Amino acid sequence: MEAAHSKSTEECLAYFGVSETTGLTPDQVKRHLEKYGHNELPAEEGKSLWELVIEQFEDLLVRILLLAACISFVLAWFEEGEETITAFVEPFVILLILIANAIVGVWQERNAENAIEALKEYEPEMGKVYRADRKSVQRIKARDIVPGDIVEVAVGDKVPADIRILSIKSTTLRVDQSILTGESVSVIKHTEPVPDPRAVNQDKKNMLFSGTNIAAGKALGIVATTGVSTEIGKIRDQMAATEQDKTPLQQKLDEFGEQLSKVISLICVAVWLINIGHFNDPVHGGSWIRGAIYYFKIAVALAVAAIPEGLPAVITTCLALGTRRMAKKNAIVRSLPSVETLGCTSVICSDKTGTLTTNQMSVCKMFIIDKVDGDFCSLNEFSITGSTYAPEGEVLKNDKPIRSGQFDGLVELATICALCNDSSLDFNETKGVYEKVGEATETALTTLVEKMNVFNTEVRNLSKVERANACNSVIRQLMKKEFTLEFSRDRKSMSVYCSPAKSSRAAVGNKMFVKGAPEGVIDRCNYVRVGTTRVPMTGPVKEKILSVIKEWGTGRDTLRCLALATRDTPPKREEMVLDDSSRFMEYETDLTFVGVVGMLDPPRKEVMGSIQLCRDAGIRVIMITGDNKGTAIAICRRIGIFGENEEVADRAYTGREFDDLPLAEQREACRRACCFARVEPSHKSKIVEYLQSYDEITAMTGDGVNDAPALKKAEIGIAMGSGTAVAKTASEMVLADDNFSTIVAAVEEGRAIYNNMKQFIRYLISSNVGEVVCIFLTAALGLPEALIPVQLLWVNLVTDGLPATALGFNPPDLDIMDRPPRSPKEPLISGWLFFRYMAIGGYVGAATVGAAAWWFMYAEDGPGVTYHQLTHFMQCTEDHPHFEGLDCEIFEAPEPMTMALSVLVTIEMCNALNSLSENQSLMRMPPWVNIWLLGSICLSMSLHFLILYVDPLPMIFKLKALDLTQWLMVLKISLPVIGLDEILKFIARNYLEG
Numbered sequence: 001m002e003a004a005h006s007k008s009t010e011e012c013l014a015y016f017g018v019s020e021t022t023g024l025t026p027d028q029v030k031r032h033l034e035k036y037g038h039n040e041l042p043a044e045e046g047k048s049l050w051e052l053v054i055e056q057f058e059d060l061l062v063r064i065l066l067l068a069a070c071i072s073f074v075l076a077w078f079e080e081g082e083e084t085i086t087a088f089v090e091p092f093v094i095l096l097i098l099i100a101n102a103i104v105g106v107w108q109e110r111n112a113e114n115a116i117e118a119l120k121e122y123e124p125e126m127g128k129v130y131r132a133d134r135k136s137v138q139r140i141k142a143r144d145i146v147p148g149d150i151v152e153v154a155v156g157d158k159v160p161a162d163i164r165i166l167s168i169k170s171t172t173l174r175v176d177q178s179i180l181t182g183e184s185v186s187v188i189k190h191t192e193p194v195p196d197p198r199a200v201n202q203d204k205k206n207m208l209f210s211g212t213n214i215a216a217g218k219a220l221g222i223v224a225t226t227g228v229s230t231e232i233g234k235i236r237d238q239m240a241a242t243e244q245d246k247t248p249l250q251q252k253l254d255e256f257g258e259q260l261s262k263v264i265s266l267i268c269v270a271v272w273l274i275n276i277g278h279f280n281d282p283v284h285g286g287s288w289i290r291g292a293i294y295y296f297k298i299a300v301a302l303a304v305a306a307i308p309e310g311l312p313a314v315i316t317t318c319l320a321l322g323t324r325r326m327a328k329k330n331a332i333v334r335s336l337p338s339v340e341t342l343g344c345t346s347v348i349c350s351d352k353t354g355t356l357t358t359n360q361m362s363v364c365k366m367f368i369i370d371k372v373d374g375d376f377c378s379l380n381e382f383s384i385t386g387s388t389y390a391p392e393g394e395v396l397k398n399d400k401p402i403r404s405g406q407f408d409g410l411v412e413l414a415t416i417c418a419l420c421n422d423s424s425l426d427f428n429e430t431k432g433v434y435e436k437v438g439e440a441t442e443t444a445l446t447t448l449v450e451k452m453n454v455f456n457t458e459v460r461n462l463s464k465v466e467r468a469n470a471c472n473s474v475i476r477q478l479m480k481k482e483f484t485l486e487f488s489r490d491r492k493s494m495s496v497y498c499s500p501a502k503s504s505r506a507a508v509g510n511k512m513f514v515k516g517a518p519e520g521v522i523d524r525c526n527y528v529r530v531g532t533t534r535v536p537m538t539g540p541v542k543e544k545i546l547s548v549i550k551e552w553g554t555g556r557d558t559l560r561c562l563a564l565a566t567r568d569t570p571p572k573r574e575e576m577v578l579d580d581s582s583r584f585m586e587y588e589t590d591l592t593f594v595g596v597v598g599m600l601d602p603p604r605k606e607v608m609g610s611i612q613l614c615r616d617a618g619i620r621v622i623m624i625t626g627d628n629k630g631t632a633i634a635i636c637r638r639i640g641i642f643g644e645n646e647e648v649a650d651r652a653y654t655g656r657e658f659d660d661l662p663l664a665e666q667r668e669a670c671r672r673a674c675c676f677a678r679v680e681p682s683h684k685s686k687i688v689e690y691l692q693s694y695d696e697i698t699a700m701t702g703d704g705v706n707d708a709p710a711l712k713k714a715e716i717g718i719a720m721g722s723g724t725a726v727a728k729t730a731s732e733m734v735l736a737d738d739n740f741s742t743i744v745a746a747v748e749e750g751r752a753i754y755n756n757m758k759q760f761i762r763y764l765i766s767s768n769v770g771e772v773v774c775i776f777l778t779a780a781l782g783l784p785e786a787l788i789p790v791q792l793l794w795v796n797l798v799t800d801g802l803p804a805t806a807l808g809f810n811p812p813d814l815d816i817m818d819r820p821p822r823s824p825k826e827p828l829i830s831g832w833l834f835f836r837y838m839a840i841g842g843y844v845g846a847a848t849v850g851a852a853a854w855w856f857m858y859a860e861d862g863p864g865v866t867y868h869q870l871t872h873f874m875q876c877t878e879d880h881p882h883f884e885g886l887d888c889e890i891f892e893a894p895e896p897m898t899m900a901l902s903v904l905v906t907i908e909m910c911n912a913l914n915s916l917s918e919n920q921s922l923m924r925m926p927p928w929v930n931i932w933l934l935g936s937i938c939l940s941m942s943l944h945f946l947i948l949y950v951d952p953l954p955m956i957f958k959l960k961a962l963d964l965t966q967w968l969m970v971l972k973i974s975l976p977v978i979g980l981d982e983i984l985k986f987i988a989r990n991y992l993e994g
């Protein structure tokens with residue numbers, strides 16, 4: 001319950017009323033366990049099987065198609081004759097498709113997995129507590145510990161709950177809290193109060209956080225909070241909440257699915273106004289049962305003409321293809337929808353350590369004393385190449401390599417690094433790369449030697465495995481490490497007492513090798529090493545050294561520096577108390593300064609040009625890290641996020657600072673700041689939300705669990721391939737190769753897909769505007785229906801399907817990565833395109849019904865009932881207006897419809913070749929520029945002549961036509977559409993632009 005790391009240990013105990021020595025009593029554990037509950041994170045329970053099936057059903061797109069398919073039963077029963085058992089295919093097929101959309105859609109909900117579960121993997125099973133009923137410590141279930149009881153932790157343990165350190169038994173406590181800062185560096189705790197209320201995790205040096213593990217030492221503390229009220233418990237709470245929003249495209253489809261509903265609901269009320277021929281014109285005559293199906297039969301037909309149910313099928317297949325495509329470029333997408341959103345990305349938020357950097361400490365600079373004369377001190381600076389722990393680099397003076405051994409000082413520099421170091425390198429045979437063993441800040445020195453190769457020992461022939469410790473192995477031979485004075489906060493340094501090899505009885509030859517914070521170690525040096533000689537430490541030589549240290553640890557090259565010294569004449573081995581660290585400082589006195597090393601977790605090789613590529617595509621890249629501002633800014637200046645001299649004083653905040661800005665100032669800082677450092681997991685998330693409060697599509701790139709809350713928050717979570725499982729689990733996309741450059745490639749691919757997608761969506765829907773105009777006409781006049789929903793489904797699912805989907809392969813425009821991000825506000829159809837389709841809509845809305853009055857009015861090989869009053873009487877419920885009457889059911893012939901249906905099917909093959917572009921006539925847009933588009937159309941008109949000749953088929957769809965001329969008739973009703981369009985473009989391509 002207690003949320004203070006700012007109180008004394010004595011006050012914290014007082015808080016819970018527990019003794020540091022005894023521990024909680026049974027009664028207290030009864031009440032605390034009561035008031036606070038168990039120490040465990042709640043699991044989010046996954047897919048609700050009744051709520052993944054329901055999501056597919058609740059969208060007017062299926063609601064309307066439902067009532068319709070359902071009304072296709074009310075009107076399915078009313079049919080005299082045996083033609084009622086062979087007239088349920090329509091209501092059948094209809095529903096059957098809504099089932100396919102359900103099945104198909106659902107199957108791709110690939111969040112297969114639990115990030116919350118992945119997180120819980122950080123809560124240990126057991127914990128160690130001290131409670132009143134026993135003197136010995138007890139190992140209980142971690143979920144049984146409560147705020148208030150004394151807990152004990154040590155080397156290897158995984159902190160069971162947020163704890164306030166009360167006492168450190170080891171001379172120091174080394175904790176690894178990357179799980180909350182993304183940094184593996186071990187942090188050194190203490191038990192003093194941290195005064196700042198608003199302190200961040202990176203500040204609570206007197207707290208132990210649930211989920212982190214103890215790198216070194218043993219300690220005693222009091223449990224401050226448990227379960228959901230802990231830092232990792234917060235990450236958990238932020239993940240649970242956040243849900244992904246509908247795609248910019250999905251969105252368009254939504255508003256559309258609403259209007260499309262408002263429209264029809266009015267088109268019907270519009271026919272009830274025109275067709276008041278059953279409310280104020282006729283007589284008694286029954287039409288309240290027969291002519292009553294003229295207000296329902298068109299209801300379930302008007303629906304299938306507005307709802308392009310088949311569009312989903314196209315996108316899904318399109319996206320799925322993109323997936324595998326990107327997967328070849330090394331980006332594994334786990335959710336299709338983000339594939340489209342990835343195209344329109346304006347902001348990429350990114351983690352530093354392990355994402356933009358390799359996360360492998362490296363010694364990149366080092367220097368030794370060169371020359372001394374009073375008041376003049378010159379050094380010998382050096383640079384080291386290599387960004388990995390791999391011994392893959394060479395040292396070099398003035399950008400030109402120089403064998404280290406030819407320099408005496410560097411022989412000692414290298415010796416201290418190898419000897420005063422409790423870590424090691426190691427080639428992982430499986431993964432195929434070297435990895436560190438111990439403190440990464442130390443393994444950096446281990447690798448530094450293998451590179452320095454001071455004794456020239458041959459290592460070129462060695463195995464990749466054994467060359468890992470070659471040069472260091474040698475050095476171990478040269479000197480025997482006796483014992484090592486640990487590191488202590490009071491001296492910020494450590495040491496190793498060593499003795500000359502092959503010397504058994506003598507006194508002389510021994511020496512200690514020291515390392516640590518420059519300031520402190522330097523001050524304890526009375527002599528400086530000059531190659532092999534040794535001269536005293538004067539003010540001029542002091543400041544000189546310091547100067548370079550000061551520059552090296554703050555510039556555009558902020559580096560962690562270590563002073564390296566040696567005590568030539570260490571005290572008598574039997575004159576030291578090796579059990580009292582408080583005495584190590586004096587044993588580390590009268591030292592001889594040797595050199596300085598500069599570390600850094602360097603940028604991945606390709607990040608700089610990747611950042612550039614984003615800049616060109618007008619995408620902003622913001623860095624958000626748990627590491628320190630000093631370091632973040634220096635990485636941004638190398639990565640290219642900041643220019644080398646660019647004033648940054650107002651566009652790079654630390655989490656604390658940022659918490660201090662007003663809400664308004666914050667939202668604003670997000671648009672200008674590009675570097676937020678020393679943040680907590682929530683800060684990352686927060687910044688993303690603000691960035692999203694500008695309608696911007698934001699991406700989050702990370703590899704840590706501290707990156708989880710923002711990954712789940714961005715429109716697109718991108719985890720590293722080498723990242724943590726939880727980060728991966730929370731992302732929509734993974735980088736199989738860890739190269740920040742593949743994000744660039746993925747954005748490209750996504751841009752290209754979004755275009756082509758946009759095409760088949762304005763093509764496959766435009767048709768519906770024609771199908772609806774067609775129906776509305778053939779009902780606002782009274783004419784015989786030329787098209788029935790049954791056919792209106794094949795045409796939209798296959799007939800249009802194949803073409804529409806061929807457009808998805810539209811050749812990606814060249815120079816598509818030099819254009820800014822598509823604005824989310826931008827509707828797919830508005831302006832002149834709204835009219836161009838508003839035009840191509842009316843044309844087909846007519847040319848289909850008119851094809852019907854060609855088999856009746858202008859009828860040659862058919863019922864030439866030239867102006868027989870289709871509008872007036874189609875009824876024929878007395879053959880009186882016709883003398884010689886004995887046949888009126890010709891208004892039901894399968895030919896007047898096989899026209900509109902053939903025209904339609906033929907018009908769409910055109911618009912498909914017309915929609916291969918937006919402002920480019922087919923003369924500049926050759927139809928053969930899309931191989932798959934030609935084949936599709938072939939495949940289309942070849943499916944028409946299938947459901948037109950295959951005996952069973954036309955039985956269900958209605959009867960044939962001979963190419964006589966009737967087909968040629970269908971042509972001069974469609975083909976001109978091409979001309980019409982080709983013109984509408986020139987009207988824009990020139991009158992609007994060019």
Ligand SMILES: C/C=C(/C)C(=O)O[C@H]1C(C)=C2[C@H]([C@@H]1OC(=O)CCCCCCC)[C@@](C)(OC(C)=O)C[C@H](OC(=O)CCC)[C@@]1(O)[C@H]2OC(=O)[C@@]1(C)O
Binds near residue numbers: 255830
């Ligand atoms: C599917 C068929 C029809 C007829 C329809 O109702 O679509 C309108 C409509 C609701 C929109 C319009 C349609 O506008 C009309 O055709 C007006 C009605 C004329 C029919 C009456 C007989 C004369 C879309 C379809 O078409 C054309 C050709 O102008 C394009 C676009 O749609 C999209 O971006 C959706 C893509 C997923 C939307 O303007 C959209 O409104 C929006 O908010 C958008 C941005 O959604």
Ligand code: ALF
Binds near residue numbers: 351625707
């Ligand atoms: F590795 Al980080 F913030 F978690 F840069």
Ligand SMILES: [K+]
Binds near residue numbers: 244713714717
């Ligand atoms: K997300």
Ligand SMILES: [Mg+2]
Binds near residue numbers: 183351353354355703
């Ligand atoms: Mg990280």
